[PDB]
Design a protein around this motif. Sequence first.
Motif, PDB file in Angstrom:
ATOM      1  N   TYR A   1      -4.324   6.659  -1.193  1.00 48.43           N
ATOM      2  CA  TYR A   1      -3.677   5.399  -0.914  1.00 48.43           C
ATOM      3  C   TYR A   1      -3.911   4.493  -2.114  1.00 48.43           C
ATOM      4  O   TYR A   1      -5.051   4.276  -2.523  1.00 48.43           O
ATOM      5  CB  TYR A   1      -4.238   4.788   0.365  1.00 48.43           C
ATOM      6  N   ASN A   2      -2.824   3.996  -2.701  1.00 40.75           N
ATOM      7  CA  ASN A   2      -2.925   3.123  -3.861  1.00 40.75           C
ATOM      8  C   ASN A   2      -2.368   1.759  -3.507  1.00 40.75           C
ATOM      9  O   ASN A   2      -1.274   1.652  -2.948  1.00 40.75           O
ATOM     10  CB  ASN A   2      -2.146   3.704  -5.050  1.00 40.75           C
ATOM     11  N   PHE A   3      -3.132   0.720  -3.830  1.00 41.42           N
ATOM     12  CA  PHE A   3      -2.711  -0.644  -3.547  1.00 41.42           C
ATOM     13  C   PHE A   3      -1.944  -1.229  -4.724  1.00 41.42           C
ATOM     14  O   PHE A   3      -2.184  -0.862  -5.879  1.00 41.42           O
ATOM     15  CB  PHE A   3      -3.933  -1.516  -3.242  1.00 41.42           C
ATOM     16  N   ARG A   4      -1.016  -2.131  -4.425  1.00 43.79           N
ATOM     17  CA  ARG A   4      -0.227  -2.801  -5.451  1.00 43.79           C
ATOM     18  C   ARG A   4       0.114  -4.205  -4.996  1.00 43.79           C
ATOM     19  O   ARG A   4       0.452  -4.411  -3.838  1.00 43.79           O
ATOM     20  CB  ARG A   4       1.080  -2.064  -5.714  1.00 43.79           C
ATOM     21  N   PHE A   5       0.021  -5.176  -5.894  1.00 42.43           N
ATOM     22  CA  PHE A   5       0.370  -6.538  -5.524  1.00 42.43           C
ATOM     23  C   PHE A   5       1.308  -7.103  -6.574  1.00 42.43           C
ATOM     24  O   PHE A   5       1.365  -6.592  -7.691  1.00 42.43           O
ATOM     25  CB  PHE A   5      -0.880  -7.424  -5.360  1.00 42.43           C
ATOM     26  N   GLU A   6       2.056  -8.144  -6.219  1.00 43.24           N
ATOM     27  CA  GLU A   6       3.008  -8.733  -7.157  1.00 43.24           C
ATOM     28  C   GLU A   6       2.959 -10.245  -7.164  1.00 43.24           C
ATOM     29  O   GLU A   6       2.521 -10.854  -6.200  1.00 43.24           O
ATOM     30  CB  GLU A   6       4.421  -8.262  -6.810  1.00 43.24           C
ATOM     31  N   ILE A   7       3.403 -10.844  -8.264  1.00 46.25           N
ATOM     32  CA  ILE A   7       3.429 -12.294  -8.408  1.00 46.25           C
ATOM     33  C   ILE A   7       4.709 -12.716  -9.129  1.00 46.25           C
ATOM     34  O   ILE A   7       5.520 -13.464  -8.587  1.00 46.25           O
ATOM     35  CB  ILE A   7       2.214 -12.789  -9.200  1.00 46.25           C
TER      36      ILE A   7
ATOM     37  N   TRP B   1       0.849  -1.178   0.000  1.00 46.50           N
ATOM     38  CA  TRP B   1       0.000   0.000   0.000  1.00 46.50           C
ATOM     39  C   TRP B   1       0.888   1.232   0.000  1.00 46.50           C
ATOM     40  O   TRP B   1       1.782   1.376   0.830  1.00 46.50           O
ATOM     41  CB  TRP B   1      -0.900   0.032   1.224  1.00 46.50           C
ATOM     42  N   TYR B   2       0.637   2.121  -0.946  1.00 51.88           N
ATOM     43  CA  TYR B   2       1.422   3.333  -1.065  1.00 51.88           C
ATOM     44  C   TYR B   2       0.599   4.538  -0.669  1.00 51.88           C
ATOM     45  O   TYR B   2      -0.627   4.520  -0.763  1.00 51.88           O
ATOM     46  CB  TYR B   2       1.896   3.519  -2.511  1.00 51.88           C
ATOM     47  N   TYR B   3       1.294   5.582  -0.229  1.00 51.92           N
ATOM     48  CA  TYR B   3       0.670   6.837   0.154  1.00 51.92           C
ATOM     49  C   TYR B   3       1.284   7.948  -0.686  1.00 51.92           C
ATOM     50  O   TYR B   3       2.505   8.109  -0.707  1.00 51.92           O
ATOM     51  CB  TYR B   3       0.920   7.137   1.619  1.00 51.92           C
TER      52      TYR B   3
ATOM     53  N   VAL C   1      -4.286   2.290 -10.433  1.00 53.07           N
ATOM     54  CA  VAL C   1      -4.215   3.691 -10.854  1.00 53.07           C
ATOM     55  C   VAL C   1      -5.255   4.573 -10.185  1.00 53.07           C
ATOM     56  O   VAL C   1      -5.062   5.783 -10.067  1.00 53.07           O
ATOM     57  CB  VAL C   1      -4.403   3.843 -12.373  1.00 53.07           C
ATOM     58  N   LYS C   2      -6.356   3.967  -9.754  1.00 58.52           N
ATOM     59  CA  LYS C   2      -7.442   4.701  -9.106  1.00 58.52           C
ATOM     60  C   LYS C   2      -7.070   5.207  -7.710  1.00 58.52           C
ATOM     61  O   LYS C   2      -6.999   6.408  -7.475  1.00 58.52           O
ATOM     62  CB  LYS C   2      -8.695   3.815  -9.029  1.00 58.52           C
TER      63      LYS C   2
ATOM     64  N   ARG D   1       5.271   9.442  -1.939  1.00 56.14           N
ATOM     65  CA  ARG D   1       5.146   8.008  -2.159  1.00 56.14           C
ATOM     66  C   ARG D   1       5.857   7.180  -1.099  1.00 56.14           C
ATOM     67  O   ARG D   1       6.882   6.549  -1.370  1.00 56.14           O
ATOM     68  CB  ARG D   1       5.691   7.599  -3.519  1.00 56.14           C
ATOM     69  N   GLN D   2       5.300   7.179   0.105  1.00 57.36           N
ATOM     70  CA  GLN D   2       5.868   6.425   1.214  1.00 57.36           C
ATOM     71  C   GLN D   2       5.170   5.065   1.269  1.00 57.36           C
ATOM     72  O   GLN D   2       4.003   4.938   0.873  1.00 57.36           O
ATOM     73  CB  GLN D   2       5.653   7.205   2.516  1.00 57.36           C
TER      74      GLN D   2
END
Length: 118
Positions: A94-100, A40-42, A109-110, A48-49
Amino acid sequence: TWGVSSPKNVQGLSGSCLLIPCIFSYPADVPVSNGITAIWYYDYSGKRQVVIHSGDPKLVDKRFRGRAELMGNMDHKVCNLLLKDLKPEDSGTYNFRFEISDSNRWLDVKGTTVTVTT
């Protein structure tokens, strides 16, 4: 399909805590073995913490350590973010991001706009 969904806005009483509901999805043909990294980014397009980091919590920015928590379960594609001890200063996006896999990663982007009142 690829994507991350969370409310466009969320209120929060300063000092208390708020919950940002969030779910994500990716193609069914994408392989999973080392799990899914949740992040989760801020203010991504600003300071962008790092607010939450499943893979290495040591990576979370000092301001958010201890005051954030991932209530979601990755195997259910749930990324519910919990913010404890809210602060007016925590107001932002707050933008969420996940990885695989190297290329099978995704940052929403929202994003969600948190407003912290007193």
